[PDB]
Amino acid sequence: GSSGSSGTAQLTIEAVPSNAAEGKEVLLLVHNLPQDPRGYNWYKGETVDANRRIIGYVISNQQITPGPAYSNRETIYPNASLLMRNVTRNDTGSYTLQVIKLNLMSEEVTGQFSVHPETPKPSISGPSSG
């Protein structure tokens, strides 16, 4: 799993796929992860606030604490990744992911995706509003 010698590195997140459809699943992978991630913490939006916290996992004690923005549809990974099942057009937006290190420190990386309504439009008339 090479990465790249030429050029600095920085924790990032790549959605996989990059654009799914309502009801589909999206796995947000991560790269340039820290040495020892004390615990991962995902959030809903562009802020690391509990009021928007989705789910947090602590490797130290291997504990899981779902936030208010939890719907029991997401799942964290040992690589600081989060799997979003049965996604929705609403989910689309921003997903901040902070990684805490044993050094009592933490990072920040906004990793989200886009969801498009991949469904047919059975209209007898034709031209409609929406």
Contacts with 129 (C-beta within 8 Å, 6 or more apart), sequence order? none
Task: Return the C-alpha torsion angle 14, 17, 21, 27, nearest 10.
Answer: -70
State the total domains in the chain: 1
Q: How far is CA 55 from its chain centroid?
A: 10
Domain of 6, CATH number, reads 2.60.40.10
Length of the chain: 130
Determine the structural domain holding residue 116 and report its residue range: 1-130
Name beta bridge partners: 101: 37, 105
| DSSP summary character for residue 50 | G
Q: Which of 83, 85, 80 is nearest to 40 (CA)?
A: 80
Q: How far apart are CA 12 and CA 111, in angstroms?
A: 7
**How do 37-43 and 97-101 pair as beta strands?**
antiparallel
Q: How far apart are CA 16 and CA 123, in angstroms?
A: 32
Q: Which of 94, 83, 89 is nearest to 115 (CA)?
A: 89
